[PDB]
């Protein structure tokens, strides 16, 4: 019952890389740059609601 602290500090005070945190908490979409064009690997399910 003390002051209010922000909380990624906890999640990082166990010596946790930001990159590992993003890998833990979010799936990734990987894009490739080639032929000066852009493409996305599509999973149709993920498009719902857009």
């Amino acid at each position: 019952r003390r002051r209010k602290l922000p909380a990624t500090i906890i999640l990082r005070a166990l010596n946790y890389t930001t990159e590992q945190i993003l890998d833990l908490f979010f799936e990734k979409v990987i894009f490739e740059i080639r032929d000066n064009k852009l493409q996305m690997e599509l999973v149709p399910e993920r498009l719902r609601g857009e």
Binding site: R1, R2, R3, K4
Partner: protein
């Protein structure tokens, strides 16, 4: 902008303020246990008092919001206070803690230093006393008192420094030297007084006598100083005496008339009025001259003596000050043991401070032991005595308290070396007491229970609401008494005149104090056996019923 301007708004903009808020929104400082109490009470005069975790229902928060008034100084108060971060240390514990925290630990050699300064101050004042011929008079007067057998041998001295025989002979030679140096008054007399004072250095007087002698010399100096101050007051204020010429002519002697007669010769008009109160002024000058005739030395050595006594006393006082502030921490350290005998902490530390003062004043370094160990004894004794005395509501003598404590210790010991418990007889076994007084002391131990202790909650009933007052006689009995007076008045009215007066006067019926046989007879002027016989005949004849039936039934 701060961390409360966003709160005070909410309070009345959203109706309430949950505990979470007033907790995190505090600055950094005054978080002290329940420092919030004051800001919550101010915020309460606006309408909050939120519950455990901020519930809601209940359209009723504006009656209490109106029931907390316009006058909002508080707002200003809180703002200022929470905008300065001066530690709101209200609890006296903290502030005293800091005050003692200021004085660092006066190491060992500093302590012996200040002990030397104390000794030096006392010795200085002792020498100063030696130096005016009105202090040995009273000495010898009370020495003779002790020797002539009008006093006691232990009421004047407690051992000299470098046996009663030796004291008697030294006072014989003192009398001789004193009288010869008084005769030789007419330079040489000053040297002989110095030598007498050097022999008088030998003496050590009982503390009470040292106090009384410094006080007798203080009161004579009081007379001197008051007479001088009043004479110079009357002069400068009534005679308009310029204060620089006052200095020049008056200063130095304050005893001779040279400045008196130069001022009157000064031809000033106030100098001529100077005779209007010349009798008073010059009488005060003469009285001062007589005071110095019993002093005898001069009017500068009075100055010297008073200034040296003040200096010595100040030195000693300052040294003792040093010691006490250095050992306050020790006092509080010793205090921690006794906190839970139903007394407050600070009272204990104060009693310890008094004990430390006494210890400091009586401590001797020459014994070669460290001060702290010696002071401990007085601090503990003082603390124990005060806790014993100011503890109980019905104060109990200290020996009885010690006996109760011993009883408790024995009780516990036997209870745990016996298994069940000790019966009062077994307690009497362990003690040499007659076993009768064990139960008495067991009764004495009961600590009055608080009159407000809440009873089993039928809410808003306390204990006091039960205790009834047996003093009040019942109204029934008052009606009885009224009927009694009526019936006695009627039966007396049935009696003859003088029989009635006899019975009324022997007792108090319808009159104040009752007169005995001789005084009633005096009021009849016939005082003899006949009056008691008249009383007895009335009594006997009233025994017969029909006159007694009303009271015969009236018996109870």
């Amino acid at each position: 902008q701060s961390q409360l301007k966003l709160l005070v708004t909410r309070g009345k903009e959203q109706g309430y303020l949950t505990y979470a808020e007033v907790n995190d929104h505090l600055p950094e400082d005054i978080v002290d246990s329940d420092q919030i109490e004051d800001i919550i009470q101010m915020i309460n005069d606006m309408g909050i008092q939120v519950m455990e975790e901020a519930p809601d229902a209940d359209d009723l928060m504006l009656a209490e919001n109106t029931a907390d008034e316009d006058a909002a100084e508080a707002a200003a108060q809180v703002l200022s206070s929470v905008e300065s971060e001066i530690g709101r240390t209200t609890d006296p514990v903290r502030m005293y803690m800091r005050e003692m925290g200021t004085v660092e630990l006066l190491t060992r050699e500093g302590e012996i230093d200040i002990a030397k300064r104390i000794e030096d101050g006392i010795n200085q004042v002792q020498c100063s006393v030696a130096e005016y011929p009105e202090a040995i008079t009273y000495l010898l007067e009370q020495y003779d008192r002790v020797e002539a057998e009008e006093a006691r041998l232990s009421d004047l001295i407690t051992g000299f420094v470098d046996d009663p025989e030796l004291a008697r002979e030294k006072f014989a030679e003192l009398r001789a030297q004193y009288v010869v140096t008084r005769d030789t008054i007419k330079a040489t007399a000053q040297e002989e007084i110095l030598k007498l004072s050097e022999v008088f250095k030998q003496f050590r007087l009982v503390p009470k006598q040292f106090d009384y002698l410094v006080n007798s010399m203080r009161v004579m100096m009081d007379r001197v100083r008051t007479q001088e101050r009043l004479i110079m007051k009357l002069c400068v204020e009534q005679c308009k005496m310029p204060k620089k010429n006052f200095i020049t002519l008056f200063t130095g002697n304050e005893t001779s008339d040279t400045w008196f007669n130069a001022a009157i010769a000064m031809n000033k008009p106030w100098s001529e009025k100077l005779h209007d109160v010349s009798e008073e002024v010059h009488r005060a000058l003469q009285k001062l001259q007589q005071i110095e005739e019993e002093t005898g030395l001069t009017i500068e050595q009075v100055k010297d003596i008073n200034r040296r006594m003040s200096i010595g006393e100040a030195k000693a006082r300052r040294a003792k000050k040093e010691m006490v502030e250095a050992n306050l921490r020790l006092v509080i350290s010793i205090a921690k043991k006794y906190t839970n005998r139903g007394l407050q902490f600070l009272d204990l530390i104060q009693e310890g401070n008094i004990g430390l003062m006494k210890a400091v004043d009586k401590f001797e370094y020459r014994r070669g032991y460290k001060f702290s160990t010696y002071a401990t004894w007085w601090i503990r004794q003082a603390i124990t005595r005060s806790i014993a005395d100011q503890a109980r509501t019905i104060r109990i003598p200290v020996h009885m308290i010690e006996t109760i404590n011993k009883l408790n210790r024995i009780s516990r010991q036997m209870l745990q070396e016996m298994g069940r418990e000790p019966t009062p007889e077994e307690l009497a076994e362990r003690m040499l007491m007659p076993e009768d007084k064990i139960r008495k002391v067991l009764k004495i131990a009961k600590e009055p229970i608080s009159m407000e202790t809440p009873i089993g909650d039928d809410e808003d009933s306390h204990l006091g609401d039960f205790i009834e007052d047996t003093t009040l006689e019942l109204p029934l009995d008052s009606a009885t008494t009224e009927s009694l007076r009526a019936a006695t008045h009627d039966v007396l009215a049935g009696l003859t005149a003088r029989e009635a007066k006899v019975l009324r006067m022997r007792f108090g019926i319808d009159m104040n104090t009752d007169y005995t046989l001789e005084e009633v007879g005096k009021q009849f002027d016939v005082t003899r056996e006949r009056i008691r016989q008249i009383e007895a005949k009335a009594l006997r004849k009233l025994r017969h019923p029909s006159r007694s039936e009303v009271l015969r039934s009236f018996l109870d």
